[PDB]
Amino acid sequence: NDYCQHFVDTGHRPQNFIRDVELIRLKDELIAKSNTPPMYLQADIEAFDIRELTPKFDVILLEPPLEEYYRKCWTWDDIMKLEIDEIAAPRSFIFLWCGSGEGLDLGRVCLRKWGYRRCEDICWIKTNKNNPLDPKAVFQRTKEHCLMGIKGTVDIDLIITEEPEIGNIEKPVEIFHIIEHFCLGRRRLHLFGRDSTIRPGWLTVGPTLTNSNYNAETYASYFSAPNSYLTGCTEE
């Protein structure tokens, strides 16, 4: 059958009809034991010299609040001016939420500006099983992109969930599972996270956080020798 046609007929997005979405849990349990305690800092990132966030990170998850999520917001002008290369480790990874509009282009510019090359394009595909427009848009937009960048030298590149309630800007927690299953290192930064996103193994920084516990000397102590080079998937 033609699900494109079906969507025109009924309003059920084609992804509504995708189906089905052995000790790969021991990997998850190693992640859990290696995880640092959750750390978090309230900071207005427009006004905040990010160089105060130390040491340099192995993974950066960047989730700037785009205007299009809502139907202060950061524009791609603002985002491109973040000095992400000043806190990234020489070999490190970025996951940048780009939305579905011009961000798919301007996010690639950001990645190259900060010194990465895009190695994956992860799409969050939103179903509307429970509920059967940009002026430049040619099609109804039913997904978002999270770009993965790499600098220096099990999962699939799709997340499928139901479209969240209007006004809900959360991204699927599956993005964390994908990032953590890569075993990229233990210094993990989430910029523009919220109270709702704080998580073991992660440093969360955002303007809406209600509480802070970040201390740079304490944070670094989690990675002092003999723990400087752990993958995040090893025994403690």
- Single residue of 51, 71, 136, 225 touching another protein by CB under 8 A: 136
Q: 50 or 104, CB closer to another protein?
A: 104
- Single residue of 56, 141, 177, 199 touching another protein by CB under 8 A: 141
Nearest CA to 89 out of 210, 228, 200 is that of 228
Residue 73: half-sphere exposure toward Cβ, Cα within 13 Å:
9
Q: Can residue 151 be called a binding residue for another protein (CB under 8 A)? A: no
Cα angle 227, 97, 123 (rounded to 5 degrees) comes to 105
User: Closest separation between CB of residue 121 and another protein, Å?
Assistant: 6
CA gap 76, 231 in Å, rounded: 32
Identity of the amino acid at 86: E
Q: Pseudo-torsion of CA 55, 74, 162, 150, nearest 10°?
A: -40
Q: Can residue 27 be called a binding residue for another protein (CB under 8 A)? A: no
Stretch near another protein under the rule CB under 8 A, chosen from 12-20, 80-88, 186-194, 202-210: 12-20
Q: Can residue 133 be called a binding residue for another protein (CB under 8 A)? A: yes
- Single residue of 50, 80, 158, 183 touching another protein by CB under 8 A: 158
Q: 4 or 73, CB closer to another protein?
A: 4
User: How many chain residues are in contact with another protein, going by CB under 8 A?
Assistant: 42
Q: What 3 state SS string does 75-120 have?
A: CHHHHHCCCHHHCEEEEEEEEEEEECCCHHHHHHHHHHHCCCEEEE
Q: Can residue 122 be called a binding residue for another protein (CB under 8 A)? A: yes
Nearest CA to 186 out of 226, 151, 127 is that of 226
User: What SS3 class is residue 229?
Assistant: coil
CB atoms within 10 A of CB 94: 26
Q: Can residue 26 be called a binding residue for another protein (CB under 8 A)? A: no
List binders of another protein among 179-218 (CB under 8 A). 182
- Single residue of 155, 162, 163, 174 touching another protein by CB under 8 A: 155
User: Closest separation between CB of residue 105 and another protein, Å?
Assistant: 6
CA gap 176, 189 in Å, rounded: 11
User: Closest separation between CB of residue 187 and another protein, Å?
Assistant: 19
Q: Can residue 131 be called a binding residue for another protein (CB under 8 A)? A: no
- In this structure, what DSSP letter does residue 49 have? -
Q: Where on the chain is the footprint of another protein (CB under 8 A)?
A: 2-5, 7-8, 13-15, 17-21, 100, 104-105, 108, 118-123, 125, 133, 136-143, 145, 148, 155-158, 178, 182
